[PDB]
């Protein structure tokens, strides 16, 4: 094709030190079997970086988004 | 009007019939001042749609990305 085994994972590396205050928004990619599905659009430089899905502030961020 | 220039919350209305299968990714706006923070980028038409926070499959979709 070159032959590809289904969808390729967009996020291959992640950043562990990203502050909620420096995020314009998060994108949760619909790529189920990938280890990394979270992308952050940064405020300071407007660039996208994949972020550590285990960052504690992310859980809080999403809970508020769900009005839960 | 550009988002950087508008004071109106990005999402005025929302949709309640967006199928998970037709979602490329969910963008979660870092907009705590607003009621609707979830936007879906669709696969088949690339449209951006604000969705209802109570959309059945959302919570599970988000939680899956955090438990990998």
PDB file of C-alpha atoms in Angstrom:
ATOM      1  CA  UNK A   1       0.000   0.000   0.000  1.00  0.00           C
ATOM      2  CA  UNK A   2       2.561   0.269   1.605  1.00  0.00           C
ATOM      3  CA  UNK A   3       0.597  -2.251   3.686  1.00  0.00           C
ATOM      4  CA  UNK A   4      -0.490  -0.930   7.085  1.00  0.00           C
ATOM      5  CA  UNK A   5      -1.916  -2.986   9.945  1.00  0.00           C
ATOM      6  CA  UNK A   6      -5.053  -0.892  10.428  1.00  0.00           C
ATOM      7  CA  UNK A   7      -4.720   2.606  11.906  1.00  0.00           C
ATOM      8  CA  UNK A   8      -1.273   3.901  12.799  1.00  0.00           C
ATOM      9  CA  UNK A   9      -0.966   5.514  16.218  1.00  0.00           C
ATOM     10  CA  UNK A  10      -0.520   9.321  15.818  1.00  0.00           C
ATOM     11  CA  UNK A  11       1.047   9.594  19.289  1.00  0.00           C
ATOM     12  CA  UNK A  12       4.333   7.680  19.589  1.00  0.00           C
ATOM     13  CA  UNK A  13       5.946   9.783  22.353  1.00  0.00           C
ATOM     14  CA  UNK A  14       4.506  11.889  25.177  1.00  0.00           C
ATOM     15  CA  UNK A  15       5.483  14.896  27.301  1.00  0.00           C
ATOM     16  CA  UNK A  16       5.107  14.433  31.066  1.00  0.00           C
ATOM     17  CA  UNK A  17       5.502  18.069  32.068  1.00  0.00           C
ATOM     18  CA  UNK A  18       2.623  20.075  30.626  1.00  0.00           C
ATOM     19  CA  UNK A  19       0.704  22.520  32.830  1.00  0.00           C
ATOM     20  CA  UNK A  20      -3.094  22.728  32.568  1.00  0.00           C
ATOM     21  CA  UNK A  21      -2.692  26.505  32.482  1.00  0.00           C
ATOM     22  CA  UNK A  22      -0.643  26.183  29.282  1.00  0.00           C
ATOM     23  CA  UNK A  23      -3.272  24.129  27.460  1.00  0.00           C
ATOM     24  CA  UNK A  24      -5.742  25.611  24.960  1.00  0.00           C
ATOM     25  CA  UNK A  25      -7.551  22.301  24.721  1.00  0.00           C
ATOM     26  CA  UNK A  26      -7.064  18.555  24.738  1.00  0.00           C
ATOM     27  CA  UNK A  27      -7.863  16.173  21.905  1.00  0.00           C
ATOM     28  CA  UNK A  28      -8.706  12.574  22.735  1.00  0.00           C
ATOM     29  CA  UNK A  29      -8.047  10.636  19.537  1.00  0.00           C
ATOM     30  CA  UNK A  30     -10.376   7.810  18.577  1.00  0.00           C
ATOM     31  CA  UNK A  31      -7.514   5.314  18.292  1.00  0.00           C
ATOM     32  CA  UNK A  32      -8.629   2.645  20.864  1.00  0.00           C
ATOM     33  CA  UNK A  33      -5.721   0.171  20.812  1.00  0.00           C
ATOM     34  CA  UNK A  34      -3.068   2.882  21.037  1.00  0.00           C
ATOM     35  CA  UNK A  35      -1.289   3.470  24.333  1.00  0.00           C
ATOM     36  CA  UNK A  36      -1.342   7.231  23.747  1.00  0.00           C
ATOM     37  CA  UNK A  37      -4.570   8.985  22.759  1.00  0.00           C
ATOM     38  CA  UNK A  38      -4.186  12.412  24.359  1.00  0.00           C
ATOM     39  CA  UNK A  39      -2.949  15.515  22.553  1.00  0.00           C
ATOM     40  CA  UNK A  40      -2.678  19.032  23.960  1.00  0.00           C
ATOM     41  CA  UNK A  41      -2.651  22.250  21.932  1.00  0.00           C
ATOM     42  CA  UNK A  42      -0.218  24.541  23.756  1.00  0.00           C
ATOM     43  CA  UNK A  43      -0.946  28.173  24.595  1.00  0.00           C
ATOM     44  CA  UNK A  44       2.571  29.644  24.599  1.00  0.00           C
ATOM     45  CA  UNK A  45       3.557  28.393  21.123  1.00  0.00           C
ATOM     46  CA  UNK A  46       0.284  27.041  19.686  1.00  0.00           C
ATOM     47  CA  UNK A  47       1.896  23.686  18.924  1.00  0.00           C
ATOM     48  CA  UNK A  48       0.521  20.187  19.498  1.00  0.00           C
ATOM     49  CA  UNK A  49       2.264  17.657  21.726  1.00  0.00           C
ATOM     50  CA  UNK A  50       1.075  14.279  22.967  1.00  0.00           C
ATOM     51  CA  UNK A  51       0.832  14.279  26.753  1.00  0.00           C
ATOM     52  CA  UNK A  52       1.179  11.711  29.516  1.00  0.00           C
ATOM     53  CA  UNK A  53      -2.332  10.231  29.955  1.00  0.00           C
ATOM     54  CA  UNK A  54      -1.522   9.594  33.616  1.00  0.00           C
ATOM     55  CA  UNK A  55      -1.136  13.291  34.427  1.00  0.00           C
ATOM     56  CA  UNK A  56      -3.409  13.818  37.425  1.00  0.00           C
ATOM     57  CA  UNK A  57      -4.729  17.178  36.284  1.00  0.00           C
ATOM     58  CA  UNK A  58      -6.190  15.523  33.172  1.00  0.00           C
ATOM     59  CA  UNK A  59      -8.660  13.496  35.223  1.00  0.00           C
ATOM     60  CA  UNK A  60      -9.909  16.654  36.948  1.00  0.00           C
ATOM     61  CA  UNK A  61     -10.047  18.525  33.637  1.00  0.00           C
ATOM     62  CA  UNK A  62     -12.240  15.872  31.997  1.00  0.00           C
ATOM     63  CA  UNK A  63     -14.507  15.412  35.034  1.00  0.00           C
ATOM     64  CA  UNK A  64     -15.330  19.125  34.980  1.00  0.00           C
ATOM     65  CA  UNK A  65     -16.001  18.924  31.232  1.00  0.00           C
ATOM     66  CA  UNK A  66     -18.611  16.246  31.953  1.00  0.00           C
ATOM     67  CA  UNK A  67     -20.305  18.452  34.573  1.00  0.00           C
ATOM     68  CA  UNK A  68     -19.824  15.456  36.845  1.00  0.00           C
TER      69      UNK A  68
ATOM     70  CA  UNK B   1     -15.514  36.219  14.294  1.00  0.00           C
ATOM     71  CA  UNK B   2     -12.187  34.621  15.381  1.00  0.00           C
ATOM     72  CA  UNK B   3     -12.131  32.844  18.745  1.00  0.00           C
ATOM     73  CA  UNK B   4      -9.287  35.105  19.857  1.00  0.00           C
ATOM     74  CA  UNK B   5     -11.557  38.097  19.242  1.00  0.00           C
ATOM     75  CA  UNK B   6     -14.952  36.735  20.326  1.00  0.00           C
ATOM     76  CA  UNK B   7     -16.141  36.766  23.931  1.00  0.00           C
ATOM     77  CA  UNK B   8     -19.001  34.385  23.181  1.00  0.00           C
ATOM     78  CA  UNK B   9     -18.560  30.825  24.421  1.00  0.00           C
ATOM     79  CA  UNK B  10     -17.464  28.718  21.379  1.00  0.00           C
ATOM     80  CA  UNK B  11     -20.364  26.295  21.743  1.00  0.00           C
ATOM     81  CA  UNK B  12     -23.778  27.954  21.577  1.00  0.00           C
ATOM     82  CA  UNK B  13     -25.715  24.779  20.801  1.00  0.00           C
ATOM     83  CA  UNK B  14     -24.983  21.070  20.791  1.00  0.00           C
ATOM     84  CA  UNK B  15     -25.938  17.861  19.089  1.00  0.00           C
ATOM     85  CA  UNK B  16     -27.216  14.711  20.706  1.00  0.00           C
ATOM     86  CA  UNK B  17     -27.019  12.277  17.792  1.00  0.00           C
ATOM     87  CA  UNK B  18     -23.303  11.907  17.077  1.00  0.00           C
ATOM     88  CA  UNK B  19     -22.197   8.293  16.666  1.00  0.00           C
ATOM     89  CA  UNK B  20     -18.924   7.267  18.317  1.00  0.00           C
ATOM     90  CA  UNK B  21     -17.936   5.442  15.141  1.00  0.00           C
ATOM     91  CA  UNK B  22     -18.067   8.730  13.207  1.00  0.00           C
ATOM     92  CA  UNK B  23     -15.783  10.548  15.645  1.00  0.00           C
ATOM     93  CA  UNK B  24     -12.177  11.302  14.670  1.00  0.00           C
ATOM     94  CA  UNK B  25     -11.419  12.825  18.067  1.00  0.00           C
ATOM     95  CA  UNK B  26     -13.071  14.771  20.860  1.00  0.00           C
ATOM     96  CA  UNK B  27     -11.605  18.203  21.532  1.00  0.00           C
ATOM     97  CA  UNK B  28     -12.116  19.315  25.140  1.00  0.00           C
ATOM     98  CA  UNK B  29     -11.863  23.089  25.292  1.00  0.00           C
ATOM     99  CA  UNK B  30     -10.057  24.621  28.228  1.00  0.00           C
ATOM    100  CA  UNK B  31     -13.077  26.889  28.778  1.00  0.00           C
ATOM    101  CA  UNK B  32     -14.277  26.606  32.406  1.00  0.00           C
ATOM    102  CA  UNK B  33     -16.430  29.736  31.904  1.00  0.00           C
ATOM    103  CA  UNK B  34     -18.668  27.837  29.485  1.00  0.00           C
ATOM    104  CA  UNK B  35     -21.313  25.162  29.806  1.00  0.00           C
ATOM    105  CA  UNK B  36     -20.223  23.148  26.748  1.00  0.00           C
ATOM    106  CA  UNK B  37     -16.551  22.150  26.422  1.00  0.00           C
ATOM    107  CA  UNK B  38     -16.803  19.037  24.231  1.00  0.00           C
ATOM    108  CA  UNK B  39     -16.423  19.270  20.455  1.00  0.00           C
ATOM    109  CA  UNK B  40     -16.387  16.297  18.106  1.00  0.00           C
ATOM    110  CA  UNK B  41     -14.419  16.330  14.852  1.00  0.00           C
ATOM    111  CA  UNK B  42     -16.302  13.949  12.562  1.00  0.00           C
ATOM    112  CA  UNK B  43     -14.656  11.360  10.305  1.00  0.00           C
ATOM    113  CA  UNK B  44     -16.993  11.392   7.299  1.00  0.00           C
ATOM    114  CA  UNK B  45     -17.343  15.160   6.798  1.00  0.00           C
ATOM    115  CA  UNK B  46     -14.677  16.711   9.045  1.00  0.00           C
ATOM    116  CA  UNK B  47     -17.288  18.963  10.639  1.00  0.00           C
ATOM    117  CA  UNK B  48     -16.810  20.100  14.217  1.00  0.00           C
ATOM    118  CA  UNK B  49     -19.868  19.564  16.378  1.00  0.00           C
ATOM    119  CA  UNK B  50     -20.438  20.534  19.988  1.00  0.00           C
ATOM    120  CA  UNK B  51     -21.972  17.569  21.739  1.00  0.00           C
ATOM    121  CA  UNK B  52     -24.130  17.035  24.775  1.00  0.00           C
ATOM    122  CA  UNK B  53     -21.941  16.251  27.834  1.00  0.00           C
ATOM    123  CA  UNK B  54     -24.513  13.600  28.748  1.00  0.00           C
ATOM    124  CA  UNK B  55     -23.979  11.803  25.437  1.00  0.00           C
ATOM    125  CA  UNK B  56     -24.075   8.175  26.594  1.00  0.00           C
ATOM    126  CA  UNK B  57     -20.744   6.912  25.220  1.00  0.00           C
ATOM    127  CA  UNK B  58     -18.575   9.929  26.129  1.00  0.00           C
ATOM    128  CA  UNK B  59     -17.563   9.074  29.710  1.00  0.00           C
ATOM    129  CA  UNK B  60     -16.487   5.547  28.761  1.00  0.00           C
ATOM    130  CA  UNK B  61     -14.602   6.837  25.715  1.00  0.00           C
ATOM    131  CA  UNK B  62     -12.647   9.307  27.857  1.00  0.00           C
ATOM    132  CA  UNK B  63     -11.975   6.857  30.684  1.00  0.00           C
ATOM    133  CA  UNK B  64     -10.574   4.269  28.243  1.00  0.00           C
ATOM    134  CA  UNK B  65      -7.866   6.705  27.126  1.00  0.00           C
ATOM    135  CA  UNK B  66      -6.820   7.215  30.750  1.00  0.00           C
ATOM    136  CA  UNK B  67      -6.624   3.510  31.618  1.00  0.00           C
ATOM    137  CA  UNK B  68      -4.108   2.173  29.099  1.00  0.00           C
TER     138      UNK B  68
END
